[PDB]
Design a protein around this ligand. Structure first.
Ligand code: VRB
Ligand code: VRB
Ligand code: MG
Ligand code: MG
Ligand code: MG
Ligand code: MG
Lengths: 150, 150
């Protein structure tokens, strides 16, 4: 089925993504038609909370970032507590122990299907250029495969 | 269909591989139980023979290297004519046009499914660490996709 195919690619991306970065969590944050996100796949190291299957109603993608991510925006944050973020934003990340994160888009048929997101937990992390390139390329490869499968 | 899904992934791998390396050819070379390989997908630049749909039996894999490739062996060759190769090896490459090559494994369910192979056809080419890493990760990601998809 189309749903089984997407999930297989998503499980591949989170597993390979966490291996590539040796970070604490990688997820696929998939959007519904109103850009409400569901954590549909997760690779997470031992001891950290599981984000899998959580629904996170974060309005900034629908309201502000859909176009930039469609166009290939990448967001990397070394220290979420030093990024000018509001408490509402921080309270989504605190339970998952996020301290640093890297966000790349999954664009399929020119549409923003979701985000591949890496977390460093309870520890800041400066994401390096070639790490970002490898992670962006992983998301693109996965997205291109899904484009070709159907 | 496993076969149709397969071909879609292979086509993504060869196209992305040739884009990443800007080389003359990238192929997927898939093994059967004699460890005879078939070129099952190809991206090739203008002017070079199409290696697509070639069955090429090379005994060195089954005789020496299958397990090593399972474990992540590569072949990086800057100039095949300075590599101490036999006429039988040179003869099997001559119709394709290979001057330099990069061979990385595709491992699925802990077996050597095939090789992802890049060719430079009219000049030597010293394959760089970053290229080897990118090409290896491409092959690994595509392999894991196939492993999970069915
Ligand atoms: C936009 C925004 N949200 C996120 C969300 C996540 N990062 C993660 O790691 C995860 C997985 C746990 C999620 C989910 C990011 C990365 C961004 C930034 C996008 C970018 O710059 O490219 C955002 N959301 C909020 C939430 C806040 N705003 C509201 O109106 C309400 C209500 C909120 C509470 C739920 C904020 C403050 C931002 C950033 C500011 C902005 O760009 O508008
Ligand atoms: C082993 C060997 N063969 C290949 C084959 C290919 N390179 C490519 O680019 C392609 C696609 C067109 C193929 C197919 C490689 C890369 C290697 C090296 C493996 C390694 O060390 O990792 C090899 N095969 C031969 C051929 C020769 N030996 C025979 O018994 C018969 C028969 C032959 C003629 C068909 C040779 C000389 C080698 C290298 C030495 C060895 O590994 O035994
Ligand atoms: Mg199917
Ligand atoms: Mg690495
Ligand atoms: Mg399509
Ligand atoms: Mg399987």
């Amino acid at each position: 089925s189309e749903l089984r195919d997407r999930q297989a690619i998503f499980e591949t991306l989170v597993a390979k993504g966490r291996e590539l970065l040796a970070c604490d969590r990688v997820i696929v944050y998939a959007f519904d038609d109103n850009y409400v996100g569901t954590v549909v796949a997760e690779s997470v190291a031992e001891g950290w909370p599981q984000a899998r299957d959580q629904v996170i109603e974060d309005p900034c993608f629908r309201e502000h970032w859909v176009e930039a991510y469609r166009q290939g925006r990448i967001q990397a944050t070394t220290d979420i507590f030093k990024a000018g973020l509001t408490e509402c934003h921080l309270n989504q990340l605190r339970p998952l122990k996020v301290r640093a994160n890297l966000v790349v888009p999954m664009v399929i048929d020119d549409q923003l299907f979701g985000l591949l997101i890496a977390h460093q937990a309870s520890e800041p992390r400066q994401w390096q250029e070639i790490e970002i390139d490898q992670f962006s390329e992983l998301a693109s490869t996965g997205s291109l495969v899904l484009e070709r499968l159907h």
